[PDB]
């Protein structure tokens, strides 16, 4: 039974944007949760449905590892039952969520002198997302009463905005990578266990 591919998920070179967060399925391997927890780099490690020490023994059906880069101040919104731009329009965690949220500062990778503006987030949306929705559409918004009809006027905003990551921005505005592990702990044939 081979080791789980956590190294790829946590040491990937380039992370995805917020609005198009990549989901990596994991299954049929021996998970090693001790390694990740023991490391000290992870600024915020929060497990919701379970306890972090229990993880070494539980057996799950399969687990999803999401990844994206968000601003430091908005990390809180990645949690069940909160709101904001990220929760409402980008990435909504369902209530009764069961998994672990992992985040760490990445100012030495995702921020370069002159600013890094390649990480985008959705700002204007008609309605909130359903849990784990991944709306990648770039439909022209309409904040004015007049119909926009696909012409980007002064009230026909493009619904994506790019973060501005200066190398010397405050800790609040520095880019934090986020990995969310979601364990759907059904009683279907267990595929991922800890030694």
């Amino acid at each position: 039974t081979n080791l789980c591919p956590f190294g790829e998920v946590f040491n990937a070179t380039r992370f995805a944007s917020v609005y198009a967060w990549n989901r990596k399925r994991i299954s049929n391997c021996v998970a090693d949760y001790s390694v990740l927890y023991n490391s000290a780099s992870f600024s915020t490690f929060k497990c919701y449905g379970v306890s972090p020490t229990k993880l070494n023994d539980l057996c799950f059906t399969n687990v999803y590892a999401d990844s994206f880069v968000i601003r430091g101040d908005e990390v809180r919104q990645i949690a069940p039952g909160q709101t904001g731009k990220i929760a409402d329009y980008n990435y909504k965690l369902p209530d009764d969520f069961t998994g672990c949220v992992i985040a760490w500062n990445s100012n030495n990778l995702d921020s370069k002198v002159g600013g890094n503006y390649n990480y985008l987030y959705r700002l204007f949306r008609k309605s909130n997302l359903k849990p784990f929705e991944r709306d990648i559409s770039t439909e022209i918004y309409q904040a004015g009463s007049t119909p926009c009809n696909g012409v980007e006027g002064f009230n026909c905003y493009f619904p994506l905005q790019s973060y501005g990551f200066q190398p010397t921005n405050g800790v609040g505005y520095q880019p934090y990578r986020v990995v969310v592990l979601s364990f759907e702990l059904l009683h279907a044939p267990a595929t991922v266990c800890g030694p």
Partner: antibody, heavy 119, light 109 residues
Framework: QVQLKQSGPGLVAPSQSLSITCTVSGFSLINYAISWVRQPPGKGLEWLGVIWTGGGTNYNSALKSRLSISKDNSKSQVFLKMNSLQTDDTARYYC??????????????WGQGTSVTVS | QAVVTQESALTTSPGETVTLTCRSSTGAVTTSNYANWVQEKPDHLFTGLIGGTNNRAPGVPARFSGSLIGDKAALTITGAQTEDEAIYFCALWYNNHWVFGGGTKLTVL
């Protein structure tokens, strides 16, 4: 710091087409729009056209539709192209930033200007 | 429907405020036609002063202030001689395009 650069020797011969480039730092092309204006020597400036935040253009009405503006978000560059030039077009051209998402609904910042002279 | 006109002649002694009016060809300027004020340095340097008919650009001194004080758009300034020798142009957003006025030459004292 927000900054606008545009560069080119410029000088043109009649009936050919030459293009100018605008290079930007300190702001992202997704959060703003870029407008181009043209300044014949000693006269009032006229507005050529705008490239909106994510593509899609407007142009000056009577100005020739045989011209286009284009951009590259990756390198933070903007290009104006005209496909045929006439001697009245000899002018200084300027890049400009339009901040219509937030507070300042006009041309927030302006470039250093490039001379384009035909003959 | 594109003609916009300015006086193009101005003089304010230091400390005294003046108003320059830019007027459209659609009657009194609407709020929709957002007003813009730009400043011309004598070395071919440009900057933006007022947008949206009320908003100062970031980093412009609070001494500068404007609005639709009269039915046509206009701008006002308290007199600071050294840094206010400049040309100023008014711009109006018609829904189809932006139109720029001829511009007004300010000659303080």
């Amino acid at each position: 710091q927000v900054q606008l650069k545009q560069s080119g020797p410029g000088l043109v011969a009649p009936s050919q087409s030459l293009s100018i480039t605008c290079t930007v730092s300190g702001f992202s092309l997704i959060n703003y729009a870029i407008s181009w204006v043209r300044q014949p020597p000693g006269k009032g400036l006229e507005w050529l056209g705008v490239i909106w935040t994510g593509g899609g253009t407007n142009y000056n009405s009577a100005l020739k539709s045989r011209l286009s503006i284009s951009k590259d978000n990756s390198k933070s560059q903007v290009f104006l192209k005209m496909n045929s030039l006439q001697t009245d077009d000899t002018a200084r051209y300027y890049c400009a930033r339009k901040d219509y998402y937030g507070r300042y609904y006009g041309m927030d910042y302006w470039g250093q200007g490039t001379s384009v002279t035909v003959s | 429907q594109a003609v916009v006109t300015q006086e193009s002649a101005l003089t304010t002694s230091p400390g005294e405020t003046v108003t320059l009016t830019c007027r459209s060809s659609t009657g009194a300027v609407t709020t929709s036609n957002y007003a813009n004020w730009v400043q011309e340095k004598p070395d071919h340097l440009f900057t933006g002063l007022i947008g949206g008919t009320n908003n100062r650009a970031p980093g412009v001194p609070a001494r500068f202030s404007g609005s639709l004080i009269g039915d046509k758009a206009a701008l006002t300034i308290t007199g600071a001689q050294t840094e206010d020798e400049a040309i100023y142009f008014c711009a109006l957003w018609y829904n189809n395009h932006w139109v720029f006025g001829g511009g007004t030459k300010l000659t303080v004292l």
